């Protein structure tokens, strides 16, 4: 059933979306990295969902931001046709566990949760191999996530930070730490968002979406080993000069 409508707006990302590129300890050094990052001062789309074609493109990677608290948000869907003729991801979260499956789901136009049956998400799944169960990811606060896949490996980074009363993204730096890497090995073109609806009842949600690009960054490590400053080498001539001079 179709019961959700969406509205869009645009805003500025400032300097957000920095994550540790590897599990190696460093301190009091300046490091140069080449990886998929969110460019500084870029368009980020603000989506408001109220109760619709939420099959947004995936591209190289996705940066997701949420500042809500009602826990109305949970799970994601990934695929290339969102049909039963191709395998798709079914990351789903709840209060106790996270279940990830890679099957050929026959997805619906507007998927959600009855709350707690996924009968409105997919009709059925028949052939698949990849299943996984673990501790759930989601645990005045802002939650930032980064999703990507390289060489058949799906990688997820996340961070949780406290935020004061602000209507826009904050100023400063906050690094992200890796959580999960999996052998996905499928073709991903579009992704999807899942919400839970109680019975239904009116609901509202809002989130920020941005896209990653291959970029070169210069990161600064303090004496304690934390990332506190970064420079994007393709933003303006001054930043390029700083990167060249290190």
């Amino acid at each position: 059933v179709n019961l959700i409508t969406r509205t869009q707006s645009y805003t500025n990302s400032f300097t957000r979306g920095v994550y540790y590129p590897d599990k190696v300890f460093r301190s009091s050094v300046l490091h140069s990295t080449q990886d998929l990052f969110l460019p500084f001062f870029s368009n980020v789309t603000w989506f408001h969902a109220i109760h619709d074609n939420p099959a947004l493109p995936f591209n190289d990677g996705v940066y997701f931001a949420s500042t809500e608290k009602s826990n109305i948000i949970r799970g994601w869907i990934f695929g290339t046709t969102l049909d039963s003729k191709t395998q798709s991801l079914l990351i789903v979260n709840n209060a106790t566990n996270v279940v990830i499956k890679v099957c050929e789901f026959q997805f619906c136009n507007d998927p959600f949760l009855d709350v707690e049956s996924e009968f409105r998400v997919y009709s059925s799944a028949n052939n698949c191999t990849f299943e996984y169960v673990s501790q759930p990811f989601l645990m005045k606060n802002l939650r930032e996530f980064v999703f990507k896949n390289i060489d058949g490996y799906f990688k997820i980074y996340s961070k949780h930070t406290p935020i004061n009363l602000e209507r826009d993204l904050p100023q400063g730096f906050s690094a992200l730490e890796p959580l999960v890497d999996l052998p996905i090995g499928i073709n991903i073109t579009r992704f999807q968002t899942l919400l839970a609806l109680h019975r239904w009842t009116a609901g509202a949600a809002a989130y920020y979406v941005g896209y990653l690009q291959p970029r070169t960054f210069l990161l600064k490590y303090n004496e304690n080993g934390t990332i506190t400053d970064a420079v994007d080498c393709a933003l303006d001539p001054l930043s390029e000069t700083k990167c060249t001079l290190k």
Binding site: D22, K23, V24, F25, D151, G225
Partner: protein, 299 residues
């Protein structure tokens, strides 16, 4: 020379030598099930290849020679004789059946039907490939037809990417409409295996082993006994395959829970985490210096 003039000369350096050796390996007691991978009496088609994950076990590769009648390994990032010493994070095993003359296509940077439509390997592959003849099991006098491969595809595959969809490939402007007419084909051909073909046209069973280097805590490696932990002495050490010599001391560094190693400006390891007790240790080179000799003339 046999004569020395008056002066001061730089001759050599002095170093302290190590006293003993230290080995530290994690708590693993299980055995990796390589036997189940081999002799499975049923191998999948190349277009739909099986993948098995191996983790949290002790790996003894020398027994693999007793499971299949292959001739030799074909490894790229490592050597077959050194596999019993390295320690990895995860192991992946893929198995399928192909033709005799396509075995050369399972290698990094290859081109061909199997390489670009069925199974693709990354250009930075680190692992081993094993192949052996299976004519006595996969051939029938009438002709086996249970093994298939994809022939047509719109775009080339990515490394470690599988395709299962069955549709009608269109080679014309008009839509196929679900019928295999003109300019419309079924992109799944079948090998015809007979026991009377040449060696190049006989079936072959292929198993590919893929390794993951140390980035996370290790889970798979061979049977190496672990000794005690000594400190404040010049000693040889081996932490999860990382070998060296030096002095091990307590560490004040604040490692994050997901970090396992520490590097310096010269990109060499200087901090380590003990596999058994989650404790941080610092590594320093043993004492050394330079020596000069002062003499008058030998006359």
């Amino acid at each position: 020379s046999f004569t020395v003039e008056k002066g001061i000369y730089q001759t050599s350096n002095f170093r302290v030598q190590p006293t003993e050796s230290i080995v530290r390996f994690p708590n693993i007691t299980n055995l990796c099930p390589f036997h189940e991978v081999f002799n499975a009496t049923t191998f999948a088609s190349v277009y739909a290849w099986n993948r098995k994950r191996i983790s949290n076990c002790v790996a003894d590769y020398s027994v693999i020679y007793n499971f299949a009648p292959f001739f030799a390994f074909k490894c790229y990032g490592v050597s077959p004789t050194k596999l019993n010493d390295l320690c990895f994070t995860n192991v992946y095993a893929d198995s399928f059946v192909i033709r005799g003359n396509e075995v050369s296509q399972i290698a990094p940077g290859q081109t061909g039907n199997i390489a670009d439509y069925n199974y693709k390997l990354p250009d930075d592959f680190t692992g081993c490939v094993i192949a052996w003849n299976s004519n006595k099991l996969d051939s029938k006098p009438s002709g086996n037809y249970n093994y298939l491969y994809r022939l047509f595809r719109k775009s080339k595959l990515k490394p470690f990417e599988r395709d299962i969809s069955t549709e009608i490939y269109q080679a014309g402007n008009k839509p196929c409409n679900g019928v295999a007419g003109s300019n419309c084909y079924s992109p799944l051909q079948s090998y015809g295996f007979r026991p009377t073909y040449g060696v190049g046209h006989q079936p072959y069973r292929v198993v590919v082993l893929s390794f993951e280097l140390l980035h996370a805590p290790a889970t798979v490696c061979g049977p190496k006994k672990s000794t005690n932990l000594v400190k404040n002495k010049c000693v040889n050490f081996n932490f999860n395959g990382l070998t060296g010599t030096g002095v091990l001391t307590e560490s004040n560094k604040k490692f994050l829970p997901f970090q396992q190693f520490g590097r310096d400006i010269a990109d060499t390891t200087d901090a380590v985490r003990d596999p058994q007790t989650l404790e941080i240790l610092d590594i320093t080179p043993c004492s050394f210096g330079g020596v000069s000799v002062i003499t008058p003339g030998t006359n």
